[PDB]
Amino acid sequence: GGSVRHIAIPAHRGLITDRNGEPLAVSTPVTTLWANPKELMTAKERWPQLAAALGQDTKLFADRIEQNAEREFIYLVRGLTPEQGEGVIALKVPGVYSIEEFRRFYPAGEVVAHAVGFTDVDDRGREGIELAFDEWLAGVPGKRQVLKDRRGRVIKDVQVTKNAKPGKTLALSIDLRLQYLAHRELRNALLENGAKAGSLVIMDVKTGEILAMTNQPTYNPNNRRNLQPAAMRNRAMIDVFEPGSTVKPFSMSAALASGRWKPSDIVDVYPGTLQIGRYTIRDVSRNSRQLDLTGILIKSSNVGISKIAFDIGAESIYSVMQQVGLGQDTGLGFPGERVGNLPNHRKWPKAETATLAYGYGLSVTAIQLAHAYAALANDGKSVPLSMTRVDRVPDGVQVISPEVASTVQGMLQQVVEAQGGVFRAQVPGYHAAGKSGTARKVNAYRSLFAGFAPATDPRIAMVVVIDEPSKAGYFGGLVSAPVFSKVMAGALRLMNVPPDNLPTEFEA
Ligand SMILES: *C(=O)[C@@H](NC(=O)/C(=N\OC(C)(C)C(=O)O)c1csc(N)n1)[C@@H]1N=C(C(=O)O)C(=C)CS1
């Protein structure tokens, strides 16, 4: 007797590695016990011992089987060892079956959870890379012919009609060594500042590769028990924030490209405030009069950058920030990734011109901010972003001219190295460049640092975001700059970049 039926052959999900082959998401065998209730209903005498072997109350187990008496498949328990599955099979209960199924394990756990994401119990990607590249990773299930008796029990395997096709291996752009370093130091910074959250992005300025992307809080994707959704946010891609002063190098790029400004030109910022009708632009350091363009960045003078913006026009500044990608679609396609907002106007009055120029009222992601600094470091050329390992580098787009980019690079090196600069961002053994930011949330603060290294031949761009530090310190040059120093120092050494901060003949 029996009936001819076709059943599926699950496909083996593809391995996800870092850029060097280190396993990040692996489908490994676990032993699973399942049951056909229609068969179980013929051997009720065996139920209590089966319940006991499954750690179930006898009556709760007997109730569950009765409530599913019309189904032909229920799970008993998933994730045993082969030895554990055999002990239950040794009861020889009709309708109880053991199978080996491949389920996801994440060997680096919380360290790359936001980037990698996870699959559901149907093993379909639902977060992070697992979702974004689900088609690549999933493969194609097969089909095989069976004969089933009246209860649904397979009584003969007839033939395979189509073989399963396994999913494909995927190598991410992430370097797990940099990821671990970034993860540990971001975690340390949250403790030292009693901060609520944070992000750290590392990018290869020559290839567009996202070398590291970590956030706090994070979660263990191997133990998703009562996960708070806040811990699951890949903030670097799905949270927007005001970049504030960290956009001032792009305002400065527009200034230098206009033909009306050189680094040694001077701006009077006395007395540290600038009234624009009912609005008042304010500096924190208000013991300045004449500042040159590098000093405007070193002191992070909102007044100074605003006066420059009045001279060159907001349109030139908006265009640079648009070109380097701030508030613009990255095109990556990460689930929930935000585009943000670069505010636009028909005509730009002084107030809107000033706030644009020092990053007030803008919305960007940490990925966008890092990509913009990568283009600046790469002599003004923006290489497309990638979450996967890049073997053939695609052509970039020139978004800032090489001469202007090179001059702004040198100014940003001075921001880190010059007297009164952001000395905590200095990278031991290397010349580094960057810009701090401190944004008041609308007192709560967000502490920023963005930069790149080595200055002589940039390789890595990095953004550090510390959300709501609660200690006495909250300025970006105190809170986020030291994280940049430690992570950049380690990342450059892990990538075997030759140190470039060597004495001249006279300094030796
Ligand atoms: C650049 O980020 C500048 N930040 C600001 O003007 C902002 N806030 O300034 C503080 C002092 C935090 C305030 O409470 O007003 C700002 C920009 S967008 C936003 N929502 N707030 C300057 N940056 C620095 C740095 O280099 O971190 C300073 C040292 C002084 S303020």
Nearest alpha carbon, ligand 1 atom 8 = 439
Q: For the stretch 293-330, what's the b/e string if a residue is b when 16 or more beta carbons lie within 10 angstroms of its beta carbon?
A: bbbbbbbbbbbbbbbbbeebebebbbebbebbbbbbeb
Task: Report the run of H or E that residue 312 belongs to, with start and end.
Answer: helix 302-312
Distance 369 CA to ligand 1 centre (A): 17
Collapsing DSSP to helix, strand or coil, 143 comes out as: strand
| Exposed / middle / buried, residue 42 (Cβ in 10 Å: 0-12, 13-18, 19+) | exposed
Distance 391 CA to ligand 1 centre (A): 40
Quick one: which atom of ligand 1 is closest to the CA of 360? 18
Quick one: which atom of ligand 1 is closest to the CA of 447? 27
In angstroms, the CA 384 to CA 378 distance is 12
**Token duo for residue 119:** 């699959």
List Cβ neighbours of 399 (8 Å cut-off, separation of 6 or more): 320, 323, 324, 325, 375, 380, 381, 382
Phi, psi of 377 (to 5 degrees): -65, -40
Mutational test site, ligand 1, from 241, 284, 411, max ligand atoms within 8 Å of CB: 284
Question: What is the DSSP secondary structure assignment for residue 497, as one 8-state letter?
Answer: P
> Which method was used?
X-ray
List Cβ neighbours of 53 (8 Å cut-off, separation of 6 or more): 87, 88, 91
Distance 245 CA to ligand 1 centre (A): 7
Quick one: which atom of ligand 1 is closest to the CA of 302? 6
**Token duo for residue 410:** 């040198």
Resolution at which this structure was determined, Å: 1.8
3-state DSSP of 51-94: HHHCCCCHHHHHHHHHHCCCCCCEEEEEEECHHHHHHHHCCCCC
Distance 302 CA to ligand 1 centre (A): 8
Phi, psi of 452 (to 5 degrees): -160, 165
**Token duo for residue 421:** 């600069």
3-state DSSP of 145-200: EEEECCCCCEEEEEEEEECCECCCCEEECCCHHHHHHHHHHHHHHHHHHCCCEEEE
Mutational test site, ligand 1, from 246, 285, 438, 448, max ligand atoms within 8 Å of CB: 438
CATH architecture of 3-171: Alpha-Beta Complex (3.90)
Nearest alpha carbon, ligand 1 atom 10 = 440
In angstroms, the CA 488 to CA 454 distance is 9
Quick one: which atom of ligand 1 is closest to the CA of 476? 27
Distance 389 CA to ligand 1 centre (A): 36
In angstroms, the CA 61 to CA 66 distance is 9
Asked whether 286 and 294 are in contact (CB, 8 A), the reply is no
In angstroms, the CA 397 to CA 187 distance is 35
Quick one: which atom of ligand 1 is closest to the CA of 435? 26
Q: What residues line ligand 1, using a CB cutoff of 6 Å?
A: 242, 244-245, 284, 300, 302, 358-360, 436-440, 445, 475-477
**Token duo for residue 255:** 């200034």
List Cβ neighbours of 393 (8 Å cut-off, separation of 6 or more): 206, 207, 208, 383
Question: What residues act catalytically?
Answer: 245
Task: Report the run of H or E that residue 355 belongs to, with start and end.
Answer: helix 350-357
Task: Report the run of H or E that residue 491 belongs to, with start and end.
Answer: helix 481-494
Domain assignments of the chain as residue spans, ordered by start = 3-171, 176-221+232-494
Of 203, 269, 204, 259, nearest in space to 236 by CA: 203
**Token duo for residue 188:** 């340390």
In angstroms, the CA 107 to CA 214 distance is 16
Distance 359 CA to ligand 1 centre (A): 9
CATH architecture of 176-221+232-494: 3-Layer(aba) Sandwich (3.40)
Q: How far is CA 195 from CA 78, 102, 170, 387, 466, in A?
A: 39, 39, 34, 28, 7
Nearest alpha carbon, ligand 1 atom 30 = 284
In angstroms, the CA 343 to CA 356 distance is 8
Q: How many CB atoms lie within 10 A of CB 500?
A: 16
Mutational test site, ligand 1, from 250, 440, 443, max ligand atoms within 8 Å of CB: 440
Nearest alpha carbon, ligand 1 atom 25 = 437
Distance 448 CA to ligand 1 centre (A): 10
